[PDB]
Design a protein around this ligand. Sequence first.
Ligand code: MET
Ligand SMILES: [Co+2]
Ligand SMILES: [Co+2]
Ligand SMILES: [K+]
Length: 304
Amino acid sequence: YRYTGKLRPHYPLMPTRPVPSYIQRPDYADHPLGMSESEQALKGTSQIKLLSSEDIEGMRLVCRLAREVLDVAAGMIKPGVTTEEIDHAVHLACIARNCYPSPLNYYNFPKSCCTSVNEVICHGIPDRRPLQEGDIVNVDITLYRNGYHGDLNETFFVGEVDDGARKLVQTTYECLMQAIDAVKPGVRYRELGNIIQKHAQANGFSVVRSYCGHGIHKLFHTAPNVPHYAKNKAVGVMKSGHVFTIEPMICEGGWQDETWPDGWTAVTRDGKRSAQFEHTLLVTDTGCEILTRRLDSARPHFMS
Ligand code: MET
Ligand SMILES: [Co+2]
Ligand SMILES: [Co+2]
Ligand SMILES: [K+]
């Protein structure tokens, strides 16, 4: 394997961390290949669930808990901390909240969160690498509580970063929020990528095409598929009671990605940096409810 940048995996990884049996587990948790039978039964379907009142309450709770766990991770970001160390804290924080860390054994993913540094577009595996001053690092949190998943991520600065890091992360955040600001009943899912790509390209950046936002509720990933680039063919129209993520990945160079031998780590083919932000959104009668927002503070962590 020819690496695309300076980042390398730092092995060995700790043995997988158990989750106490009192915590409710998603179907894939005990599947030998981490397949989700429930997801697989709906593969290829475009139909989108209209959440009940009970569903909405369940999503509100799990997404609030997820935000709390991301905030725990945000508090740990400093030069010298390993991504494994972040992940262990996340794992314990999920357990403390009576939640299962959704990524754990999801299609055999080995850890409880995804940590994506510099050229990693997404799905980085926490490992022995200490964070370096100047890095950017994304932590992506997903929790499972009472049958519901809640999903969010933010990119953080490690100590002092360069102007390019600042511009990339700021623009990415703005892309997410411009998209969220457009969500309301009657808007086509395909419009979001037009908005994201417009702002990205105005700032000299590209939009990852291989990964998309997703429906989430009882399933971790389901309809709708929500591309973040322009002129996409996504199927569907927002309606009150729809829940889905928006999770744009934006790159300093070209948009092309490739995957490490680990089968997970997605990296820029050019080795330039990428940044991401994610919220889980509920479409309401007039707009949307940002289920994974901060309740206590105005801004994402990188502006705080
Ligand atoms: C290793 S599964 C991680 C998935 C990621 N949280 C997402 O937003 O889809
Ligand atoms: Co996520
Ligand atoms: Co997601
Ligand atoms: K990154």
